[PDB]
Amino acid sequence: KTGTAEVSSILEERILGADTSVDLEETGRVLSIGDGIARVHGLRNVQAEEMVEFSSGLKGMSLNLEPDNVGVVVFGNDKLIKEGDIVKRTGAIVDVPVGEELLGRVVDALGNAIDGKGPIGSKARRR
């Protein structure tokens, strides 16, 4: 934080204050990324512990609401992404599909099939 955006690129436009103006608030640009931790610049307005959504599609979640960026645990890859990637808010924390059709079902923790029984139906989703 104290280096990034004190240094150029990132900084280099904030100066002007022209850089979406800034936004990245319901968006983020991945401030730094490595290793499933998307420090995502922006997303600024955020909820707490929001599940956010990736330019790699993917989710990560904005647990760490930092004043600059979002510590986003990206729940997966880094070989997709390369920096600055756009993260779009979802405005929303996780709730998970719940239902009774999961009875009879193996899902991943996403509450999505892995069962290879095709997909499950998601009736409810629930916090």
């Binding site: 280096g3 004190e6 690129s9 280099e12 436009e13 002007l16």
Partner: protein, 167 residues
């Protein structure tokens, strides 16, 4: 975000991480020089306390310190993105640190293409040199000054000590 642009000197960043912003920023839009001079100005425009010393006084609210130190005053003609970066160093307290950014900067369009080799006495004296040709000698001739024993010495310049140094 942007893409890397760095006037000759150029620098290392770091308290010049800003410098480098403007080593891309100023550079781009090529008010490179506008600001290049701005900075110079700023330096002493800076240097006196006031609404600046304000910061020191922790208890002065940075929030409005920017709106005072930079509102009326540092925008006196320091503005483009220049007040905004003022207002950034401002936030980012890099104001006491700013001189060094200028230092760092200022070797920039001129001194951007400086003169380096570390050379006895008042050594190099950041200018410009073209590495294919010698430029060295010339300089030396110009002067028959500096101090070279007190200033850099016959030990460097020609080993006064070395003969001692073998034993």
């Amino acid at each position: 975000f942007a893409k890397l642009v760095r006037p000759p000197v150029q620098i290392y960043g770091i308290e010049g991480r800003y410098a480098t912003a403007l080593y891309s920023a100023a550079s781009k839009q090529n008010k490179l020089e506008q600001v290049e001079k701005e900075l110079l100005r700023v330096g002493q425009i800076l240097k006196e306390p006031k609404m600046a010393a304000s910061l020191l006084n922790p208890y002065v609210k940075r929030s409005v310190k920017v709106k005072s130190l930079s509102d009326m005053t540092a925008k006196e003609k320091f503005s483009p993105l220049t007040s905004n970066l003022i207002n950034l160093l401002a936030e980012n307290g890099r104001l006491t640190n700013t001189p060094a950014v200028i230092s760092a900067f200022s070797t920039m369009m001129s001194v951007h293409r400086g003169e380096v080799p570390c050379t006895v006495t008042t050594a190099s004296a950041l200018d410009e040199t073209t590495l294919t040709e010698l430029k060295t000698v010339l300089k030396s001739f110009l002067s028959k000054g500096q101090v070279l024993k007190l200033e850099v010495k016959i030990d460097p310049s020609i080993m006064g000590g070395m003969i001692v140094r073998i034993g």
